[PDB]
Design a protein around this ligand. Structure first.
Ligand SMILES: NC(=O)c1ccc[n+]([C@@H]2O[C@H](COP(=O)([O-])OP(=O)(O)OC[C@H]3O[C@@H](n4cnc5c(N)ncnc54)[C@H](OP(=O)(O)O)[C@@H]3O)[C@@H](O)[C@H]2O)c1
Lengths: 125, 337, 48, 110, 48, 48, 96, 97, 48, 48, 14
């Protein structure tokens, strides 16, 4: 909808306003900026994933990549099941812990959930 | 599959995007008849109607001199006659200029996704967007059961920072208007008008976390302020994973209000300019005049890179920085600085 | 060329608006200007 | 039945009339003025039907004014479309959408 | 159901590994792993 | 005490000034005069 | 200063703290008459009132079948008569 | 004078984190009810119904700071959530006051 | 008096004025279109 | 049940450093803060 | 019967 960019915007050398999509060799970092009522200005800078991975050893990164691609296969499965059977959203009916355990679970920072015989996740009693 | 495109594309495009407001999507709102009420002072008695003894009293309480009520000795009913001088409210309608608004596709329902009927009935539509959103957002991140988080992390490290400008606009109307009008309305509508009730429902239905809940109201910018809040929260040990985003709905009362401020674009005037709904919104244009109302939410889940890699979840980007900023001294609240 | 021209369309759409934009985006030399406008040459009134 | 009551109606219709007379108001003044405008609304459609006949529907359609200064669209922002078409071409080459051959590149460059 | 494209170690990441190895505390790096929306154009997928 | 599995954030924050839970003298309660919020509050602060 | 306590204390204590709601402090709110509105369907025509041409239209827009508006040929004003079937809003009050 | 803060500190270090459960209740009513009733009501009432417009007015009248503004809605507990928010915000360099 | 009698006789007194206003509206869409022909063609042509 | 009431409450907060440097009163040290959600439920108003 | 007359009563009550 870039009819015709306002002549005012010419003076901003560092900004170029594209009226059509451009496929590039890549983008490294971006800046989103929003402003709000009552002097509410915010800005966030996001940087490309590769740069995080460059912290790791090919050893690590490649171990992770196998994890990811396994997840995607679960995800893929789920998403398709959901579309068909209208279950992309599943309401939980009970917390992970029986009420008996609750206070304890809350208070022990180690307590974690183990997969169960029915594929479900619960805290061990 | 091959036919889908032919059968439906035309419709799909016509009933999504920035389009003419569709009243069905808003319980009958039609900018072309904006209902108001005008106080009239009756200059006559008007004829009697029957009423319960209780209602009669109610009427007499409010009107006094200007109402007569008497028993029907036969059926314990009563009769209400307003007298001259009494005050009445007569509906009238207006032709509002904001005919166009960007609205969720004509047909979308949180039920297709699997939100339970009872929860559908109980909560503000806003929450429904937020619920579905967070659900699809957890999938995009490879989490099927949010409980998986509690394989790697303690209950107190999944955080919830979703906000909005004024969410629960339907419930809001329900208590400030629909209740005054004596229309059938929930007892708990107050619950669903709070900005953080959305966040609450997310936790009461999916993540049963004792994590933090910092929920922001940064008007047009909440969604970023939210990212910021979750960010800080995570880098202070409060949490390792964290839902973030913003939401807000489209409402008769909202749309009308923005128009009074001068922020939205006058559809009628833009139609006079040969514009089309959709050609309406031109961010950098010369002809740009005002913004476009729209609805919905947006969410991103966020984590420490460590927990991310350890879990083995997708990584879309690095939140390199966030921040919020006030401008100078002024008197124009809506002004950008 | 650096020409400023006024173009008429008797089928003034968005699509038609966009079209002429597409043009000026790719032809509009320095100094040029495109001004599109609805018009019906069948109408004496329009002409004047 | 309806005759045991048709005296009533008659009685009251006369009632109504003499009251009107007293209030100095023509009850049929509305129907009168209506008939009236509905006659002039014939001399109209009369003349209108002439034009319609002498010229036909397509012509009738085709002479309808359509020019409106408010619908005018001005495109003048060359400076921007430049840097675009510029940056656009750059990547074009890097992916081979533009090969050095293609007359296209020439054109774009000009 | 596409996750984001994982970069190629050699072509994309290797070239920076030298400077950036262990140069960042991964427990104080904040990362977006999830994405979604509902709006006038649909979910983030259709919207895109 | 930041993220120490062996130190309650309460301990932590307190110990950093050379204090233990025993030094925590007054607890101001929400105590809203509702039936449940007052049981609960005590119960939480107590278990704590 | 010495008198302050005697002159004002009694009042000050009575008009602060948790107390009976004081309508002046709330633009007239009085829990003892919680105003509502009830929809009534008129079962008669009710008499005409004058209105601006614009207002008249507004009314006719909302009501249609159930309202008549006509010019006052003399002052460009209009006349609004709601007809039987029209919908009205009558105030009532509650003891909260 | 709140400007004294700008003897020791930069405009961008005075922060504003005041919140509420649903503030601007009067303006709220004014637009959801008083307007429907055609009662005489401001054009900008929408402004004054936002939880953060309170915070805004504080900054537009006293502290002319380019500091942060994280404004919280934690219902009955906002006031503490607020303390928390300002706390974190300060310990991350975002602000000093 | 007059009104309640009318009501009894089941007769709208203003039904005439109502229908009049009505036809006097359609008599505008007419003169509207008619004014077009008149404008596009002029008097002498109209005559001719 | 609880009692409705009105008004606000404010505290200004600083780094101890800036506090001492300025030379402003010190009412206390914010030793810790935190927010906490409870378990899965359906009662929104319930305290956990 | 009583409806052929209930218009009357109505008329006169008014
Ligand atoms: N091509 C040949 O061999 C040849 C030979 C002799 C003469 N010509 C002349 O070339 C000129 C261009 O025509 P063309 O043959 O190249 O293409 P064309 O297909 O005849 O183009 C006609 C154009 O005229 C516009 N138009 C149609 N009705 C109109 C109306 N009622 N009011 C205003 N504009 C209207 C339309 O533009 P919009 O879509 O924008 O409304 C349409 O694109 C004509 O004058 C034609 O006589 C061409």
């Amino acid at each position: 909808n870039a009819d015709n960019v306002d002549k005012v915007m010419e003076q901003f050398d560092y900004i170029v306003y594209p009226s059509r999509s451009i496929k590039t060799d890549g983008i490294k970092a971006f800046s989103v900026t929003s402003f709000g009522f009552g002097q509410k200005g915010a800005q966030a800078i996001g940087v490309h994933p590769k740069y995080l991975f460059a912290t790791l050893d090919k050893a690590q990164y490649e171990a992770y990549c196998v994890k990811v691609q396994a997840r995607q296969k679960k995800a893929y499965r789920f998403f398709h099941n959901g579309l068909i059977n209208n279950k992309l959203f599943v309401a939980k009916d009970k917390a992970p812990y029986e009420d008996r355990i609750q206070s304890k679970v809350f208070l022990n920072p180690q307590s974690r959930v183990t997969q169960e015989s029915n594929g479900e996740l619960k805290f061990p009693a | 599959d091959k036919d889908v495109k032919a059968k439906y594309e035309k419709y799909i495009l016509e009933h999504s995007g920035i389009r003419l407001i569709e009243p069905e999507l808003f319980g009958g709102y039609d900018p072309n008849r904006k209902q108001l009420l005008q106080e009239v002072v009756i200059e006559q008695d008007l004829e009697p109607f029957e009423a319960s003894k209780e209602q009669a009293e109610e009427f007499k309480r409010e009107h006094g001199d200007k109402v007569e009520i008497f028993e029907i000795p036969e059926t314990g009913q009563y009769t209400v006659r307003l007298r001259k001088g009494a005050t009445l409210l007569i509906p009238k309608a207006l032709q509002f200029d904001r005919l166009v608004a960007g609205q969720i596709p004509t047909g979308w329902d949180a039920r297709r996704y699997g939100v339970p009927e009872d929860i559908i009935q109980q909560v503000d539509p806003v929450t429904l967007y937020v619920l579905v959103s967070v659900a699809e957002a957890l999938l995009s991140s490879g989490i099927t059961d949010p409980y998986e988080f509690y394989k790697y992390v303690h209950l107190s490290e999944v955080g919830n920072c979703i906000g909005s400008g004024v969410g629960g606009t339907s419930a809001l109307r329900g208590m400030y208007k629909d209740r005054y009008l004596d229309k059938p309305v929930q007892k708990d509508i107050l619950q669903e008008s709070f900005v953080n009730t959305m966040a609450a429902w997310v936790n009461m239905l999916l993540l049963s976390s004792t994590g933090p809940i910092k929920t922001p109201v940064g008007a047009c910018a909440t969604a970023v302020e939210s990212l910021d809040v979750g960010y800080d929260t995570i880098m202070q040990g409060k949490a390792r994973v964290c839902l973030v985003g913003g939401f807000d709905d489209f409402q008769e009362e909202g749309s009308y209000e923005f128009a009074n401020m001068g922020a939205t674009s006058n559809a009628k005037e833009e139609f006079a300019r040969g514009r089309e709904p959709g050609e309406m919104s031109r961010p950098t244009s010369t002809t740009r005049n005002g913004f476009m109302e729209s609805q919905g939410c947006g969410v991103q889940v966020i984590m420490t890179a460590q927990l991310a890699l350890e879990m083995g979840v997708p990584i879309y980007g690095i939140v390199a920085m966030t921040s919020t900023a006030t401008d100078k001294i002024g008197r124009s609240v809506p002004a950008p600085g | 060329g650096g020409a400023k021209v006024i173009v008429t369309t008797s089928r003034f759409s968005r699509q038609v608006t966009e079209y002429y934009q597409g043009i000026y985006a790719r032809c509009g030399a320095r100094g040029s200007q495109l001004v599109v406008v609805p018009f019906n040459q069948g109408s004496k009134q329009d002409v004047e | 039945i309806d005759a045991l009551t048709k005296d009533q109606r008659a009685l009251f219709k006369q009632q109504l009339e003499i009251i009107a007379r007293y209030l100095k108001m023509d009850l049929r003044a509305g129907d009168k003025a209506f008939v009236a405008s509905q006659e002039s609304q014939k001399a109209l459609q009369a003349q209108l039907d002439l034009w319609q006949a002498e010229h036909g529907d397509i012509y009738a359609a085709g002479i309808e004014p359509a020019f409106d200064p408010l619908k005018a669209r001005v495109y003048d922002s060359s400076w921007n479309w430049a840097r675009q078409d510029a940056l656009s071409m750059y990547y074009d080459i890097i992916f081979g959408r533009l090969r050095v051959v293609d007359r296209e590149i020439v054109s774009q460059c000009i | 159901y596409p996750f984001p494209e994982l970069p190629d170690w050699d072509k994309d990441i290797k070239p920076l590994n030298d400077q950036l190895r262990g140069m960042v505390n991964l427990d104080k790096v904040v990362v977006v792993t999830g994405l979604a929306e509902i709006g006038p154009w649909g979910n983030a997928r259709t919207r895109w | 005490w930041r993220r120490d599995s062996r130190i309650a954030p309460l301990r932590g924050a307190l110990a950093t000034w050379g204090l233990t839970i025993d030094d925590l003298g007054v607890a101001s309660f929400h105590g809203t005069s509702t039936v449940a919020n007052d049981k609960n509050e005590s119960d939480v602060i107590c278990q704590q």
